[PDB]
Design a protein around this ligand. Sequence first.
Ligand SMILES: NS(=O)(=O)c1ccc(Cc2c(-c3ccc(F)c(-c4ccc(Oc5[nH]nnc5C(=O)O)cc4)c3)nn(-c3nc(C(=O)O)cs3)c2CC2CC2)cc1F
Ligand SMILES: Cc1cc2nc3c(=O)[nH]c(=O)nc-3n(C[C@H](O)[C@H](O)[C@H](O)COP(=O)(O)O)c2cc1C
Length: 335
Amino acid sequence: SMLPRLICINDYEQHAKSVLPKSIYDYYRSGANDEETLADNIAAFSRWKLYPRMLRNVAETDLSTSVLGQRVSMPICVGATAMQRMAHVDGELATVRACQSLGTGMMLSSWATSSIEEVAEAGPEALRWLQLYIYKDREVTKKLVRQAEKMGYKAIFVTVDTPYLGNRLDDVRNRFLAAYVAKAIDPSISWEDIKWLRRLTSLPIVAKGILRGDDAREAVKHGLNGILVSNHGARQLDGVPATIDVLPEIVEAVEGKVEVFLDGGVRKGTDVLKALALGAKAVFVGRPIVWGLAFQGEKGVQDVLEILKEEFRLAMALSGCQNVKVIDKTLVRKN
Ligand SMILES: NS(=O)(=O)c1ccc(Cc2c(-c3ccc(F)c(-c4ccc(Oc5[nH]nnc5C(=O)O)cc4)c3)nn(-c3nc(C(=O)O)cs3)c2CC2CC2)cc1F
Ligand SMILES: Cc1cc2nc3c(=O)[nH]c(=O)nc-3n(C[C@H](O)[C@H](O)[C@H](O)COP(=O)(O)O)c2cc1C
């Protein structure tokens, strides 16, 4: 009952725009270039129509599932978002605490405003994963992985779509990064560097930012454990498809050999249901978490995750799904 009265994820965004400095809100909101993919990440979900089954018995809903062999309370997890401390003083420590309370997983940015150890201490019982860039400096890359293994993180999400930073026009206009990303991130990396990381760690490895069937198959062939279908929140290459539109081609391409996840434009419970109906194991949210932080730190993130949880529960119930095992491709049809 905290004010203003926010009852959906778009209310959290509207609140954030009213309290964040322009250049911070713009950094978090922006897509790349004309933001074609940004609009489509959202619009594409509306074109997938639901076909609810009546009279299935939805008295008891169970949202529980597993990610990479680890139980979660719901198929709705926190994605890596850099610079959470610009949204709230507690930053990633607030986030992990909310994930611990919800029983869901947090993917930590490889350049978070909090250390791998600090986040493990704030959230010792939270399911925690590390998002990894392969830096030009492979010694710091290796150290992050070792620190993740040591601090009880359960997987590496290696981001492969950012050899350079996307062109976000508001960040250029605000004089808000591309030059710094280009100093640290290695744009030379290939499947050879994936072989290296696959040998470096026995943690589960997900390739984050695949949009092609052939690349997904290359990821399976290299012993990777998951695909995160991502266009990096439409902040990298503008004019790529919406993740919900390429998800089915990627699911088909991997023939059940690895878990397939989605991010990009998840705002509502029906977005989660549509993604699972098309074969995603779970979805990740980026921006909604930041809007949560901007509203009220830990409680704001908990609020956003609880809103998505309960929207998802209702969408499951109204569609005749008592649990995620019964969510099938006949629930959806593109229009
Ligand atoms: N609390 S803490 O001590 O752990 C802490 C961690 C991180 C930072 C910030 C940081 C930046 C750093 C700077 C300035 C920045 F502006 C950024 C940055 C912020 C947001 C970005 O946004 C995105 N990344 N991926 N996608 C996006 C997007 O916006 O879509 C990118 C870069 C990073 N680099 N950097 C690197 N150093 C090396 C190297 O060779 O030694 C390799 S990485 C680090 C340390 C990190 C360990 C590696 C400070 C600490 F205090
Ligand atoms: C503000 C912000 C910071 C981000 N930082 C990172 C990052 O550090 N590492 C990474 O792999 N992806 C990063 N991403 C991409 C997200 O992990 C994720 O793909 C995206 O937010 C999903 O789309 P959504 O914002 O529509 O939920 C970032 C995205 C945003 C919006």
